[PDB]
């Protein structure tokens, strides 16, 4: 989407695995807050916003 | 009513505990009260903060 | 300690880093003392092909 109208992606009822995401060096910014990008893999989320 | 002097020496030991277990939920600027928390969801360089 | 790598992995040459380089090559301590110097080498160390 444009930015102003931006898309939201609800994601649950599912394990995913966010060592693939993060260690995969194209992309140009990885921050996290609240959590260690290394430890997500360690935790579960009632849901997740995209 | 008579024994007030003694009934509160019992009463502020027991308000003086209570408060100090209280202060365990207190954040202090951290991301959370409760250790575990921290422990489990960041790394050494950002727990140790 | 002297040792070549892709532009994108000299940002895993820090302590407390993971990934490839960090994990399997090149592993600096928690407290690691020294400084870390790199430059692009594309001239000398690329080839054709």
Do not use: H, M
């Not at chain 2, 009934?7 to 959370?32: M, P, R």
């Amino acid at each position: 989407a444009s930015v102003y109208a931006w898309n939201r992606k609800r994601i649950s009822n599912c394990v995913a695995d966010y060592s693939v995401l993060y260690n995969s060096a194209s992309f140009s910014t990885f921050k996290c807050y609240g959590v260690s990008p290394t430890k997500l893999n360690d935790l579960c989320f009632t849901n997740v916003y995209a | 009513s008579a024994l007030g002097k003694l009934q509160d020496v019992v009463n502020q030991n027991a308000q003086a505990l209570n408060t100090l277990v209280k202060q365990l939920s207190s954040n202090f600027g951290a991301i959370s009260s409760v250790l575990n928390d921290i422990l489990s969801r960041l790394d050494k360089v950002e727990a140790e903060v | 300690d002297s040792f070549v790598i892709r532009g994108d992995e000299v940002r895993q040459i820090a302590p407390g880093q993971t990934g490839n380089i960090a994990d399997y090559n090149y592993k600096l301590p928690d407290d690691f003392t020294g400084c870390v110097i790199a430059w692009n080498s594309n001239n000398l160390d690329s080839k054709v092909g």
